[PDB]
Write a protein that binds this DNA or RNA. Structure first.
Ligand SMILES: Nc1ccn([C@@H]2O[C@H](COP(=O)(O)OP(=O)(O)OP(=O)(O)O)[C@@H](O)[C@H]2O)c(=O)n1
Ligand SMILES: [Ca+2]
Ligand SMILES: [Ca+2]
Ligand SMILES: [Ca+2]
Length: 341
DNA sequence: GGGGAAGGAAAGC
DNA sequence: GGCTTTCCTTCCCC
């Protein structure tokens, strides 16, 4: 397998720069304003100019402003970024019929039948970068390797606006030298459970007793890491299809008053249906984030499609279930639809 | 013993 | 902040 992974640079911020070139060279911060108060909300992402100083995805808009008070703060325009992403994805389809669109700004291409070696793979990578630059003036990073995990790691090592090949020789080196925390799928919590074990390199997962590993991080993640460490990881590139669509909104103030919560729940339903666009869900879940920030959900699956009227009435019953079973107040409220016909 | 369904955990975008 | 996917735990049932 020769996998070519594409990851768009500072995506949301870059799109804003393409639509407004005068932004080039200035720190730009794309924000998710929640509406609770002046600047409440978080940073979706920021371009290099702002990230260099610590303004990154996830931090409070308020903290970003403390760091860079004169940066350009822009509201997230997800619909615009999605449309631009879709066009780039269409360009990528032209280089291989085996394409896995992983997120709003990533895609894996199995170019095994397209190139003979990594030299050719690398050249195709340049061709792809130039094609996207020519057509949408968007820069991206290309990672190439023998499988999806290392192709992604290669891009991580090369961003931004880069391209890198991790050949077989280097894959073996990385299995030995790469911090296991930097392996896709290992977040802070798993990285912590692993440390508890002496494991901080993939290679270390081979000598530890499987059951010990499995009991700490779970069977799936254990087998995953071990397969990688043995250099036997094999996962085909496959067409992905959305499985769920939803919307969650933050309420002006916390509450567990049904009538006070309904307008938000209903608004969330309306927007979710907008997004479904022709897809008919058979399952609906009401999702609530409590005052202490926990997430609670109650759902229902129907033997048929869910009409918006049915979504409205069932959502109330589910929310009622949440209120009848959980004592905490609610901060955010929303819905999630799945099991499309 | 183990698959399926519901709800929570964890991860990355 | 807020969107989506995948795996885990618990319990029902064959
Ligand atoms: N917590 C996060 C992480 C990412 N994103 C958004 O998802 C897109 C890209 O994911 P990511 O690769 O993490 O952000 P980039 O800004 O593109 O960073 P880079 O240039 O380093 O690839 C971004 O444009 C933004 C988000 O809303 N919230
Ligand atoms: Ca990425
Ligand atoms: Ca990116
Ligand atoms: Ca990590």
């Amino acid at each position: 397998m020769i996998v070519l992974f594409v990851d768009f640079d500072y995506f949301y911020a870059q799109v804003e720069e393409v639509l407004n070139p005068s932004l080039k060279g200035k720190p730009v911060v794309v924000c998710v304003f929640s509406g609770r108060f002046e600047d409440s909300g978080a940073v979706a992402t920021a371009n290099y100019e702002a990230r260099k100083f610590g303004v990154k995805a996830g931090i409070p808009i308020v903290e970003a402003k403390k760091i860079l008070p004169n940066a350009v703060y822009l509201p997230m325009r997800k619909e615009v970024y999605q449309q631009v992403s879709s066009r780039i994805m269409n360009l990528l389809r032209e280089y291989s019929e085996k394409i896995e669109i992983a997120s709003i700004d990533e895609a894996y291409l199995d170019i095994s039948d397209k190139v003979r070696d990594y030299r050719e793979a690398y050249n195709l990578g340049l061709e792809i970068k130039n094609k996207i630059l020519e057509k949408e003036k968007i820069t991206v990073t290309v990672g190439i390797s023998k499988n999806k995990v290392f192709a992604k790691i290669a891009a991580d090592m090369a961003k931004p606006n880069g391209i890198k090949v991790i050949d077989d020789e280097e894959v073996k080196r990385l299995i030995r030298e790469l911090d296991i925390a930097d392996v896709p799928g290992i977040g802070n919590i798993t990285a912590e459970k692993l440390k508890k074990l002496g494991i901080n390199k993939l290679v270390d997962t081979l000598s530890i007793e499987f059951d010990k590993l499995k009991g700490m991080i779970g069977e799936a993640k254990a087998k995953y890491l071990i397969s990688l460490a043995r250099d036997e990881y094999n996962e085909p590139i496959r067409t992905r299809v959305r499985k769920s669509i939803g919307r969650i909104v933050t309420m002006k103030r916390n509450s567990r008053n049904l009538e006070e919560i309904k307008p938000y729940l209903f608004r969330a339903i309306e927007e979710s249906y907008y997004k479904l666009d022709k897809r008919i869900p058979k399952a609906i879940h009401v999702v609530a984030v409590t005052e202490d920030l926990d997430i609670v959900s109650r759902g229902r699956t129907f033997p048929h499609g869910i009409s918006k009227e049915t979504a409205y009435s069932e959502s109330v019953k589910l929310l009622q279930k949440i209120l009848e079973e959980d004592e905490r107040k609610i901060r955010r409220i929303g819905v999630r639809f799945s099991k499309f016909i």
